[PDB]
Structures are given as C-alpha cells and as structure tokens.
Ligand binder design. Structure first.
Ligand SMILES: *[C@@H]1O[C@H](CO)[C@@H](O)[C@H](O)[C@H]1NC(C)=O
Ligand SMILES: *[C@@H]1O[C@H](CO)[C@@H](O)[C@H](O)[C@H]1NC(C)=O
Lengths: 49, 49
C-alpha cells in the first residue's frame, strides 16, 4: 500500500535511500518488492553559513 | 495516534484515498474509525509537457 501505491517518507521502510517507487513480484508463498531508491554519491566539501 | 490526532500521508492506512481526518467511535470490544477521505473524480485528458 505504501511503497507500490504511493511514495513513502518512512526511512528504510521501502528500501535504503530515499524511496522513489517499488515494483511487486510474486514468489511461492510470498511477495518480492523491487524498491527503487535515490542514493546520493560523490559529495563535495563546502563552507556553509 | 496517526489518523485521528493528525493527518496521515501513509497510503491506504487511514482509508482509501487522500486522508483528511478520522473520527473514533466506540464499539463492544473494539473501536470504529470514520475515515474522511478525499478521492478525485471527473477526470479530463490534457496534453502535457
Ligand atoms: C572534507 O575535508 C576533510 C578534512 O579536510 C576530509 O577528511 C574529508 O574527507 C573531506 N570530505 C570530502 C567529501 O571530500
Ligand atoms: C480520455 O481518454 C480515454 C481513452 O480511452 C477515454 O476513454 C476517456 O473518456 C477520456 N476522458 C476522460 C474522462 O478521462
């Protein structure tokens, strides 16, 4: 309900990183979610105020 | 806590649609929530960019 039908702000609920969308996949006696997430990379130091 | 005392962004948690607010009602050995919800209607196709 929260990952597939929507976008969840809950941290590490629908996968690590910032959630974008999820895709359900069937399995024997279960369900498999492919949690697409946005992971930042290669940060840079900056002076801030 | 989440539906009555506040507004829930969780999809299909506090009712089917965009949750506005909920109202609790007591019942024997349980509780009843009246989930007020905003569901859109009257769609119209439009070209987008
Ligand atoms: C920022 O600078 C500190 C010390 O100069 C260094 O240890 C750190 O790795 C730098 N971070 C990045 C992302 O370059
Ligand atoms: C939009 O296009 C579809 C094409 O199948 C059509 O059925 C529908 O009536 C159109 N308008 C609405 C109400 O979204």
């Amino acid at each position: 309900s929260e990952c597939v039908l929507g976008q969840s702000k809950r941290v590490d609920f629908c996968g690590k990183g910032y959630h974008l969308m999820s895709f359900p996949q069937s399995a024997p006696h279960g369900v498999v979610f492919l949690h697409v997430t946005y992971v930042p990379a290669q940060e840079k130091n900056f002076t801030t105020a």
